[PDB]
Write a protein that binds this ligand. Structure first.
Ligand code: FK5
Ligand code: FK5
Ligand code: CA
Ligand code: CA
Lengths: 113, 113
């Protein structure tokens, strides 16, 4: 599998290519995800709550790295995102979970579009 | 299981009670469904398309019987809705699938909220 670095600085890698429908901006998508800090510390997983996460792709209600990075996935796909801080939580971080200026790694599994 | 007839004329019956979170107006819910006419002719199923159906419960983008009927389901539950035409497609029906003045029967499986 290849790694793609976009103009924004996002990096992504398809760990498994999906066989289903393609995710496009505008669609309401459902995913499972896991998030880690660059030291390997897991900070969150939707699988731990057994609760798929739904959002409007390109809707501006998730961090920029997600809105950009989930586009192009196919249902059944697992994509790994490496999100630099300007496309995540930037200088502020996310109180008690994500430090200031953090690069974030997510694995995203696309369940439906 | 019991059958409930609401003030609107909607009838619903919980074929299986869900064990997960309750569906409330406002939530974006994901379901599988099958739809039939009162003579048992199947007109649609999301299972046949392998494509779960997401919608905003109470958002007015589904027939009135759905917006009302899916409220109160729990994740994992299967609810049968009997929808009179005034809470469905009324006198117009829906070209080449649902005739005028059709009572509709749906089975709805709540996948996520
Ligand atoms: C009303 C609020 C509750 C509402 C909560 C949910 C829908 C449940 C949902 C599963 C979130 C998780 O709850 C278990 C939990 O997910 C994290 O652990 C996480 O993995 C993460 O990073 N995710 C979630 C998955 C999408 C990407 C990213 C995100 O974009 O999250 C978004 C986020 C926090 C954006 C901030 C918003 C503030 C800005 O200042 C900042 O701008 C830089 C960016 C989330 C989706 C918000 O849009 C909406 C919410 O917050 C956060 C570390 C903290 C967060 O809990 C709050
Ligand atoms: C932009 C258009 C595409 C867009 C299509 C999708 C998102 C895909 C989605 C799975 C629909 C199915 O696509 C395969 C297919 O589902 C049926 O087979 C069906 O089982 C059905 O009855 N459903 C769908 C499940 C929710 C309840 C109900 C519905 O409320 O459907 C709504 C409906 C048709 C409402 C009419 C709208 C016009 C009014 O005049 C009338 O007012 C009384 C009510 C649907 C969700 C619309 O909001 C949005 C759309 O149409 C219809 C028999 C025909 C319909 O395809 C068209
Ligand atoms: Ca959910
Ligand atoms: Ca879908």
């Amino acid at each position: 599998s290849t790694v793609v670095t976009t103009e924004s600085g996002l990096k992504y890698e398809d760990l498994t290519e999906g066989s289903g429908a393609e995710a496009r901006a505008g669609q309401t998508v459902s995913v499972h995800y896991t998030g880690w800090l660059t030291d390997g510390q897991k900070f969150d997983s939707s699988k731990d709550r057994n609760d798929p996460f739904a959002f409007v792709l390109g809707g501006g209600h998730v961090i920029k790295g997600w809105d950009e990075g989930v586009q192009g996935m196919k249902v059944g796909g697992v994509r790994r995102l490496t999100i630099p801080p300007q496309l995540g939580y930037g200088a502020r971080g996310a109180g008690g979970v994500i430090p200031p200026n953090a690069t974030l790694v997510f694995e995203v599994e696309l369940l439906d579009v």
